[PDB]
Amino acid sequence: LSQDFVEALKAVVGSPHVSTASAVREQHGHDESMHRCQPPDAVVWPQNVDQVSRVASLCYNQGVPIIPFGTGTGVEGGVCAVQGGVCINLTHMDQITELNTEDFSVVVEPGVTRKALNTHLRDSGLWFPVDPGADASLCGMAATGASGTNAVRYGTMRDNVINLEVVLPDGRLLHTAGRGRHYRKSAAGYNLTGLFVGSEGTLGIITSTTLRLHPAPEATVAATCAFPSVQAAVDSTVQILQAAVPVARIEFLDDVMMDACNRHSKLNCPVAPTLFLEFHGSQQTLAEQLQRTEAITQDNGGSHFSWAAEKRNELWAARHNAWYAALALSPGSKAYSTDVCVPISRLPEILVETKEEIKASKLTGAIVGHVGDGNFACILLVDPDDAEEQRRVKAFAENLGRRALALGGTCTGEHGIGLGKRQLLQEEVGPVGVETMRQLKNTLDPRGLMNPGKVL
């Protein structure tokens, strides 16, 4: 970047809020993925939406790529500056506004995390349910189309984003459903909100998200259930869903994952393929749900439920930190991930096959997953210097993605495409799907400067 351009950035946001220092750029050049750190040419922290718009307009008109940056917890290289440019760290805009408890809605800026929102909401009787394990930017979660353990009951980001404020690549300000609007449903025009959820910073910069809030459950029960086999745990999951038990959380850990979590959390669960379960209801609807869920797990060899405020928090903290538990197995490893999602009836086939394929290869791997959605992740731990191992693990991940596609599923349930799944996406939606997505990309970002090299 020229020094005139850098001074122009400083004129917008203030000198302390622009950095061209290599260390600062390198910290913003990677996420949690394997994709090589590619440092942006500068990092900029806008302090308000007007500044976001002016930074975007300056970059766009000068041919400088723009990389939106939330909390940098993505796992597909979304923030990697493959073509250089300006990384826009959005987290100084950290205000919660327009809290409408009577309407179950709130507006959050990119610096607001789920933990901050739910802390702000304690005593309200409301909470925000979509819970990635990282305390991520809520606007980043809208950008990636995130889900979480609670999504099986309470929906994904797509289900819970009511409106978005978006700075388009050339700086124009768009309120996807209209400025200030919030409602339960609409047929008014084309739904623009859904287009920007899961856009990963390639269509514009989300500067606020209007979120659906949910009533806190009357009563909560959590438990773990150990199984003799992966087949037994996943058959139980499918049968629980087919019986329409409205479980709040249903999470799978294979024996490898469970052992890693034990070692990283001082849980001490039996080392076995395991379901972490949570139920929400009145003290008596719970008794009904438990009754019927235990009957199904018992049919498949599940243990009697090991019951879990403080022990349940411990349970879900261990689950949320599964990524770090797996990385801690061999210190220094980074890791590759998968994220397939299949029709639920095909979930037993693909999980059992994945476990078998992990055994049959040199590969080390742990399995954890939002199986209530038909979704799971492989965590594939690698040496950052062993190029041969990385080639095998990438080949494994691509084969797993293609197997999910063969079953009618999707290559990513929640993490997104970034740099890692672009070729799988082309196979998933085919030539007319690819061209259609590209046409939408081109009308919003004619110059191709909005997070280039990602998704498409």
Ligand X SMILES: Cc1cc2nc3c(=O)[nH]c(=O)nc-3n(C[C@H](O)[C@H](O)[C@H](O)COP(=O)(O)OP(=O)(O)OC[C@H]3O[C@@H](n4cnc5c(N)ncnc54)[C@H](O)[C@@H]3O)c2cc1C
Ligand Y SMILES: CC(C)C[C@@H](O)C(=O)O
**Could you list the residues that contact ligand X (CB under 6 A)?**
31-32, 67-75, 78-79, 90, 110, 132-134, 136-137, 139-141, 143-144, 146-148, 200-201, 205-206, 323, 414-415, 451, 454
67 interacts with, out of ligand X, ligand Y, none, CB within 5 to 8 A per kind? ligand X
137 interacts with, out of ligand X, ligand Y, none, CB within 5 to 8 A per kind? ligand X
Structure tokens at 240: 């629980």
With b for 16 or more beta-carbon neighbours within 10 A and e for fewer, the 383-409 pattern comes to: eeeeeebbeebeebbbebbbbbbebeb
| Residue 151 or 225 having the CB closest to ligand Y | 151
250 interacts with, out of ligand Y, ligand X, none, CB within 5 to 8 A per kind? none
C-alpha 421/C-alpha 145 separation (Å) is: 15
Best CA proximity match to 323, nearest among 337, 313, 311: 337
**Which residues on neighbouring strands pair with residue 391, listed in sequence order?**
none
* Helix extents (H) in 332-411: 347-360, 387-406
Q: Is 133 in the site for ligand Y (CB under 6 A)?
A: yes
C-alpha 309/C-alpha 452 separation (Å) is: 45
C-alpha 434/C-alpha 176 separation (Å) is: 23
Q: Is 315 in the site for ligand Y (CB under 6 A)?
A: no
| Residue 130 or 296 having the CB closest to ligand X | 130
Q: How far is the CB of 438 from ligand Y (least distance, A)?
A: 27
Single out the residue of 96, 323, 340, 449 in contact with ligand Y (rule: CB under 6 A): 323
**Which residues on neighbouring strands pair with residue 390, listed in sequence order?**
none
Residues in contact with ligand Y, total (CB under 6 A)? 8
337 interacts with, out of ligand X, ligand Y, none, CB within 5 to 8 A per kind? ligand Y
Q: Tell the burial category of 230 from Cβ atoms under 10 Å away from its Cβ (0-12, 13-18, 19+).
A: buried
| Residue 368 or 417 having the CB closest to ligand Y | 368
Q: Is 382 in the site for ligand Y (CB under 6 A)?
A: no
| Residue 70 or 401 having the CB closest to ligand X | 70
Show me where the chain is broken: residue before each gap, C-N > 2.5 A.
308
Q: Tell the burial category of 3 from Cβ atoms under 10 Å away from its Cβ (0-12, 13-18, 19+).
A: exposed
Q: How far is the CB of 334 from ligand X (least distance, A)?
A: 12
Q: Is 322 in the site for ligand Y (CB under 6 A)?
A: yes
379 interacts with, out of ligand X, ligand Y, none, CB within 5 to 8 A per kind? ligand Y
Residue type at 258 in one-letter notation: M
Single out the residue of 199, 208, 224, 337 in contact with ligand Y (rule: CB under 6 A): 337
Strands 365-369 and 334-337: unpaired
| Residue 209 or 297 having the CB closest to ligand X | 209
Structure tokens at 19: 């950095």
Residues that bind ligand Y (CB under 6 A): 75, 133, 322-323, 337, 368, 377, 379
